[PDB]
Each structure stands twice: as structure tokens, then as C-alpha cells.
Amino acid sequence: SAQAINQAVNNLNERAKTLAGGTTNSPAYQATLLALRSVLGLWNSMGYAVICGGYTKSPGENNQKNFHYTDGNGTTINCGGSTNSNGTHSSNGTNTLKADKNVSLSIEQYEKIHESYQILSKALKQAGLAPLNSKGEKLEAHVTTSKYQQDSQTKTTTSVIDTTNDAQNLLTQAQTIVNTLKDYCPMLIAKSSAATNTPSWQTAGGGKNSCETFGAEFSAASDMINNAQKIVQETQQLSANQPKNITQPHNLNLNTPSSLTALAQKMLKNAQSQAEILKLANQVESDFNKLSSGHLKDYIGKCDQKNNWGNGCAGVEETLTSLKTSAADFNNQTPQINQAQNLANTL
Amino acid sequence: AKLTIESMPLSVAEGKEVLLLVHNLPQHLFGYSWYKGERVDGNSLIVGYVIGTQQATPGAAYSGRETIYTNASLLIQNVTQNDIGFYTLQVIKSDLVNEEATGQFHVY
Numbered sequence: 400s401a402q403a404i405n406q407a408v409n410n411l412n413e414r415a416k417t418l419a420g421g422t423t424n425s426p427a428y429q430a431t432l433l434a435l436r437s438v439l440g441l442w443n444s445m446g447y448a449v450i451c452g453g454y455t456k457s458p459g460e461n462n463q464k465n466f467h468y469t470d471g472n473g474t475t476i477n478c479g480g481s482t483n484s485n486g487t488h489s490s491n492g493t494n495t496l497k498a499d500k501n502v503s504l505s506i507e508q509y510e511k512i513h514e515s516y517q518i519l520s521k522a523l524k525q526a527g528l529a530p531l532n533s534k535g536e537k538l539e540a541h542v543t544t545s546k547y548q549q550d551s552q553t554k555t556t557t558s559v560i561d562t563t564n565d566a567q568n569l570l571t572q573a574q575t576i577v578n579t580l581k582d583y584c585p586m587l588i589a590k591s592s593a594a595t596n597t598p599s600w601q602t603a604g605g606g607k608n609s610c611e612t613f614g615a616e617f618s619a620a621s622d623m624i625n626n627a628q629k630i631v632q633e634t635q636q637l638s639a640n641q642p643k644n645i646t647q648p649h650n651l652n653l654n655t656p657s658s659l660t661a662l663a664q665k666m667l668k669n670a671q672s673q674a675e676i677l678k679l680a681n682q683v684e685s686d687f688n689k690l691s692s693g694h695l696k697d698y699i700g701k702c703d704q705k706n707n708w709g710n711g712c713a714g715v716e717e718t719l720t721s722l723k724t725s726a727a728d729f730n731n732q733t734p735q736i737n738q739a740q741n742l743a744n745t746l
Numbered sequence: 747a748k749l750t751i752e753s754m755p756l757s758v759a760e761g762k763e764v765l766l767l768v769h770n771l772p773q774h775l776f777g778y779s780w781y782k783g784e785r786v787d788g789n790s791l792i793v794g795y796v797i798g799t800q801q802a803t804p805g806a807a808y809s810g811r812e813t814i815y816t817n818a819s820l821l822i823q824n825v826t827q828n829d830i831g832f833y834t835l836q837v838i839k840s841d842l843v844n845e846e847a848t849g850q851f852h853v854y
């Protein structure tokens with residue numbers, strides 16, 4: 400009957416709008432956010448130890464660049480230099496040897512990580528993640544670096560990037576950070592014989608290859624982003640297939656066997672998109688558990704001269720809880736969606 | 747204690763070969779490089795090696811006669827008068843602290 404069909408349509412559409420447009424109540428949004436915060440947490444946890452500044456074309460370059468971070472305390476990462484045995488800074492360090500896979504990042508590769516990190520961080524701070532069915536809003540991200548001048552001074556530059564807080568843009572930034580590490584596998588700095596405290600994974604003696612130390616972690620973070628991107632794509636497929644209620648229920652010229660079969664198949668596409676989104680959202684939770692169960696187990700989920708390098712400081716545990724709570728709400732509504740499919744299938 | 751270079755032999759005949767041996771090489775290294783002359787200078791790079799890579803990278807001062815080993819030794823074969831003077835080794839340790847040493851040999 401038309402009463403029953405309109406009920407099933409209203410169930411689908413109400414559930415879809417929460418899923419596509421909700422924040423706190425949408426596991427799609429919470430999964431996407433979890434992936435973004437996880438990548439920020441990854442970089443806050445181990446990014447400081449990444450060796451950078453290997454030369455690209457020529458060792459005559461003698462290139463150095465400094466990259467600026469702010470918690471509210473500020474820190475600075477040098478790429479290219481080293482420290483002399485007496486403690487003074489040397490302009491000849493990692494830049495004396497060639498940048499490539501399993502060695503170090505180039506200055507160009509590091510500045511891409513750094514920029515993506517500042518965009519992602521500042522977007523989430525200034526605007527939050529936009530709803531997944533939204534265009535998002537424009538915002539300005541600031542990226543601060545410095546360079547050494549002829550003999551004397553250090554010149555600091557603050558760049559302004561016009562960017563947005565939509566999921567697709569932010570997932571792209573996260574993907575840049577993860578793929579740079581996973582594809583170029585830079586070496587990590589060892590503990591000595593800008594972090595105050597030393598995490599357990601950063602041992603004295605020999606340095607470790609980042610893909611050896613964090614192979615499982617990088618793969619988990621990469622899968623989180625890829626599944627989040629698919630959530631975003633399914634959410635737009637959901638926003639396309641929005642079935643209409645039957646008006647004029649008794650009018651068989653308006654409501655034909657053709658138009659009602661098209662409606663029924665639109666209802667099924669909506670429901671199948673919803674199911675796939677929730678499955679992806681559960682896979683993101685599974686991948687977060689992979690990410691947070693190895694070397695980063697006592698680090699990624701926590702936050703406390705002084706700086707927060709070595710800890711995640713990204714609110715991942717809070718988001719995980721909100722993912723679980725919202726996912727359970729949608730899972731409890733599965734019976735009213737199964738009957739809505741069974742209602743559509745008979746047509 | 748400190749990184750030092752030994753030339754072998756101390757004085758070399760023209761056409762012959764010389765080995766720059768390294769004493770007190772630190773145990774935990776990121777990489778190292780050899781330079782022609784008395785200064786660390788990319789323009790005078792003979793060859794650099796990164797730990798874990800299996801293959802060294804030559805620089806502008808490379809002449810086809812130099813072999814680096816993973817004890818940081820540098821062998822120079824078919825020596826001439828142009829090879830007179832200083833050679834510099836820089837080492838980058840795993841914590842990004844560097845050490846530097848100078849070698850030399852006479853030629854006749």
C-alpha cells in the first residue's frame with residue numbers, strides 16, 4: 400500500500416539526512432573525522448624524528464630550511480643541517496647526502512608534509528570538518544618557515560593559503576602526509592647517547608627506517624583515509640538518490656507501474672548506499688585499532704622548553720567514542736531498513 | 747676517542763695507490779662523505795654513502811679512481827701530482843651529530 404511505502408521512504412530519508420548531514424550523530428562524519436585526526440596524531444607522535452634535507456640536484460646547493468610549529472608553545476624543525484660535536488649548529492648535515500627512498504626527505508617533500516599538516520590542523524581548529532553533504536567554507540591557513548641569509552641572519556616567512564574545510568580537500572592533505580612517508584620511507588633520528596620526553600620506539604644506537612618501525616601504522620592510516628574517501632563518495636551517491644513520497648495515492652495515471660518501480664529501485668540504491676557507508680565506517684574503526692595498538696599505543700591517544708612532540712594531541716579517543724555511539728544508533732535502526740528493502744523488492 | 751685518518755703508505759709513488767684508513771669510526775651512523783681538500787664543501791665532494799643503501803653516490807671531485815668501503819676507507823688508485831694535499835671525511839651519526847677528520851699523503 401501507499402501508506403506503507405511512504406513510511407519506508409520517510410525512514411530511509413530521515414536516516415540518510417542524519418548520515419549525510421549530521422555531525423555528532425553521523426558515523427560517516429565521525430569516521431571521516433577519525434581518519435583526519437589520526438593522521439594529525441601520527442605526525443604529532445613521530446614526525447619530529449623524520450630525517451629531512453637531503454640534497455636533490457647538487458651537494459653544492461647546501462640548502463637548509465626551518466619549519467615552524469605551534470602547540471601553545473612553538474617549536475622549529477631544521478631540515479638540511481646537523482649538530483657539531485661541540486654543540487654548535489652546522490650548515491653541513493643531512494644536505495651532504497642525496498635525498499631518496501630509505502634515506503631522507505628532500506626539503507620540497509618536507510615542505511609539502513608541513514603545509515598539508517598546517518592546512519589540516521588549521522581547518523579543523525578554525526572551522527571544524529564540514530558536513531559530508533556540504534560544500535564547506537573558505538578559510539585562510541598560515542604556514543611559517545625560515546631560512547638562513549648571507550652570513551648573519553635568519554629570515555622568517557609566514558605564507559597564507561586560501562583553503563576549505565570540506566572532507567575531500569582535508570582527506571587530500573592527510574593523504575599527502577601518509578603517502579610521502581609510506582612511499583619514501585625516510586630514516587628516523589635515534590636518541591642520543593624537538594621532543595622533551597623520548598617514546599619507547601625511539602631507541603639509542605642505530606636509526607630506524609620509518610617504514611620498518613611504522614609499516615603497520617602507515618598501512619592502517621593509509622586504509623583509514625582511503626575508506627574515508629569512499630565514505631565521502633558514497634555519501635554523494637546517497638544525496639543523489641533521494642526517493643520522493645507518493646502523492647495522489649489513488650491516481651494511477653500519476654502513480655504508474657513504471658514510476659513506482661523506479662521509486663522502489665531508487666529506495667534500494669539509497670538503502671544499499673547507507674549499508675555500504677556503515678560498513679566503511681566500521682572498517683575505519685578497525686583500522687584505527689591497527690594504528691593505535693603497536694608502537695604508538697601509549698602515545699597517539701594522549702596529550703599533556705616544553706612541547707607535545709611524541710604524543711598524538713589530536714582528540715582521537717573522543718572521536719572514536721562518538722563514532723561508536725553514533726554507529727550503534729544506526730545499527731539499532733537496521734530492522735526498519737530491512738523491511739523497507741523487502742517492501743521495495745516485492746515491487 | 748676522536749675520528750682520525752691514516753694514510754697507507756704515508757708517501758706514494760706516482761702511478762701507485764694510497765688507502766686512507768679511518769680509526770675510531772662511530773658505531774651508529776646515518777652516513778658519511780669524502781671531500782677533496784681540507785673543508786667539508788659539496789663542490790669538492792668525492793663520494794658519499796648512506797648506511798642501508800648498498801650503493802655510494804659520487805660528487806664533482808670524483809675522478810673514477812676512488813673506491814669507498816663501509817669501514818669508511820677511501821682507496822685512490824693511479825695517483826698523480828694533482829692528488830697532492832688534503833682529504834676530509836665527514837661522518838653524520840644516527841642522532842645527527844657530525845664528526846670530521848683530515849687526511850693527507852705526499853706524492854713523488
Ligand SMILES: [Ca+2]
Binds near residue numbers: 443468469470707708
Ligand atoms: Ca607538536
Ligand SMILES: [Ca+2]
Binds near residue numbers: 798
Ligand atoms: Ca637495514
